[PDB]
Symmetry: C2
């Protein structure tokens, strides 16, 4: 096979011009789509805010229209999914992951409006879910859409355009282009065999998508954390210890989301009415908690700078962590459309800060800043539960811009993945696609 290789080597990186151009098209659309979605969620959270002021005196009445507004919006989200596109519930990343293995269908004519408006409700209602869930699955379907429209033929085009769509979706959700491309080549793409996903083309989509986001969302970062302090060599062992903590909690959190999928499935049994009602109950709880304790509900991007800056007490940190574990599980294991990335960044930050605080008092000779352990533990739950550390690290790096902490971020993130494996944990996205694939045969 030496003679095949010599031929192959000389023919390396010559992606078909038709694929490159369409990748630029997919990226732009996924970009505009993600911006539109982001503008929609913001508007709804804003109306709900304005409604609570309309009745800002009668506290029991105000606690109600908080609930109902998010309850109604939640129900509308669960319903759009159950009735028109059941595959558009939950994260959406496992579904696009399956579509790359050619084992799941990309029904773009249905999921595009279902996910966009269904997620618009769950997110707009202030449930503990992330934007990447919608944007990635939408992005993947946008990729499939132009494939069918322009009738491009081949596995390369199908696999590529479906990949650049998912990548341009994650990148436009975080303003993180590198994390988007890195997600495709570490987690998304077919993991157990070869594939023809042109990386150069995945880039072009991610660029155009990011450029679209930059045109409509510039000047205001999702997470501003400032330039933190550096990390001395003799302080590194503290980050490994932190990673080991995430490493044994990761798999545990993984079981809970899986098990809570089951327990919540008994409440409705599969019935479209019991489910939608259960959704509004959960959704209504979040919009309520999003007024009496806003750190326990919502995406989580708001309490990240606050936690890093050490403006929370240890009592508040413990409270927020427990309360968010609950509302994260309740929201993601319910089947509502929405990703789990963003609330796992928040969970990781809080826990990291908690470790950072104890680290500060036990070791004043290290001159520690608890905000360094928050950034280190920020993409750690992504590492111990999702088991894609290289993506989670570059994601955090792209959002916090604290490169002088790259070693603690890596050391913690890897201690997470090591202990997640060694304690019998499984990739949450892959352990879901298997649960979905195996039930498609169980029945």
């Amino acid at each position: 096979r030496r003679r095949q290789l010599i031929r192959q080597l000389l023919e390396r990186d010559k992606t078909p011009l038709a694929i490159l151009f369409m990748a630029a098209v997919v990226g732009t659309l996924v970009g505009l789509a993600a911006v539109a979605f982001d503008k929609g969620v913001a508007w709804l959270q804003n109306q709900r805010m304005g409604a609570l002021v309309h009745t800002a005196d009668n506290y029991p009445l105000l606690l109600t229209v908080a609930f109902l507004c998010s309850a109604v919006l939640a129900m509308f989200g669960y319903f759009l999914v159950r009735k028109y596109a059941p595959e558009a519930g939950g994260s959406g990343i496992p579904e696009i992951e399956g579509a790359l293995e050619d084992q799941r269908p990309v029904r773009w004519w249905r999921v595009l409006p279902v996910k966009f408006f269904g997620g618009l409700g769950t997110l707009g209602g202030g449930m503990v879910l992330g934007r990447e869930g919608p944007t990635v699955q939408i992005g993947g379907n946008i990729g499939r859409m132009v494939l069918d429209i322009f009738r491009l033929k081949g596995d390369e085009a199908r696999h590529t355009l479906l990949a650049t769509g998912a990548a341009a979706g994650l990148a436009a959700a975080f303003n993180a282009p590198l994390a988007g491309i890195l997600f495709i080549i570490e987690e998304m793409r077919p993991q157990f065999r070869y594939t023809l996903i042109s990386i150069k083309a995945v880039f072009i989509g991610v660029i155009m998508s990011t450029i679209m986001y930059r045109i409509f969302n510039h000047e205001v970062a999702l997470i501003d954390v400032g330039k933190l302090s550096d990390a001395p060599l003799n302080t590194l062992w503290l980050y490994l210890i932190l990673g080991i903590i995430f490493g044994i909690f990761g798999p545990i959190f993984n079981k809970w989301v899986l098990g809570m999928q089951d327990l919540l499935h008994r409440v409705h049994g599969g019935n479209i009415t019991k489910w939608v009602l259960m959704g509004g109950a959960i959704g209504g709880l979040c919009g309520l908690l999003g007024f009496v304790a806003p750190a326990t509900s919502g995406g989580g991007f708001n309490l990240i700078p606050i936690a890093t800056a050490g403006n929370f007490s240890m009592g508040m940190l413990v409270f927020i962590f427990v309360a968010r574990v609950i509302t994260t599980l309740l929201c993601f294991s319910s089947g509502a459309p929405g990703g789990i990335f963003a609330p796992m960044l928040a969970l990781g930050t809080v826990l990291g800060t908690a470790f950072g605080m104890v680290a500060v008092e036990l070791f004043p000779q290290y001159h520690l800043e608890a905000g360094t352990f928050a950034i280190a533990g920020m993409g750690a739950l992504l590492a111990a539960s999702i088991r894609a550390p290289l993506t989670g690290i570059i994601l955090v790096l792209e959002m916090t811009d604290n490169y002088q902490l790259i070693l603690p971020m890596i050391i913690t993130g890897l201690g997470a993945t090591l202990l997640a494996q060694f304690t019998g944990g499984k990739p949450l996205y892959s352990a879901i696609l298997a649960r979905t694939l195996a039930k498609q045969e169980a029945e």
Copy 2:
């Protein structure tokens, strides 16, 4: 399908034996990289002090400059030709071949040959990079412990050989991310499936970097400061720059390939004609490394100076031309040493050139030429080696100007696109092919 459902549930369960050994490989590749780095620095230092010993007789001083680097070069070419011919040139294509199981990893030979052979060419101040030695060494270090502990399996052989190459790039630039990204974008078997545990490559890259940090902290290879931001209406200039790199990339690619040929006629394959030609080239660098140091050496020294715009346009053009010459002469001669570093310097200079023109044509954009230098810095890496995602993350890790990520990506991709469309080829893959085809003919 039921196979997939089985595979999914068994995803990321890298054997603990492979993980532990990866930590060992990285540590060794780390220390080895550190020691190599300390060696090269020492020799460049001695030559410096010897020029002071005779800092009056200008003709005499121009000589002991030549000779010191000339002799050191000769010792380098000889160590390669006599004991490990595969340890000449970059060394990256060689490890790349090893991953395809199409080249042998003779670690018992290459380790001392490359370490000391590179110690001469680099220490002589030739236009070569540290990653050549460190990556190839790192791969063989990885192969070494595989053999020593007698680990069995393709996974172990493929992984340990990869973590070693990654941990060698990482310990050469203090760039852990670019190290891991290099394996999964360029190094690993590109046309079929493989069993390279990414988690294990990480562990090696960490421990290697940690070793580098223990002996080289507080002083960055490239300090450039925090540059200005890049407005949205300024992005088209970066695509234009990438287009320029995109057409020069393939051209430079032909020249390095062609100069390999022409320099092979001078010695014909003879070990003596070669080594003597080596000291001629190597002696030129140590000479040029005194009368115009910007035209010789790795290049990391003129990078901050160029970005800060402390060069004139006249000097910039000179430096670019004079470095195209001394880069080809050094890498196409077969001397041990990587071509990454001198391509970063080539990309920086061309970028600053484009930046300066941009500044005067567009005062309404309020431009800083140092932004185009950082954009163009990993552009030659993109248009010639054709690994843009690694080149971008490499520059990012070394310059720490993340607020320029869009220009860096737009330029880097405008390089790879035009490199393809103008019939260019991956220089590292266009070499492994040249080497594999002379093997079956």
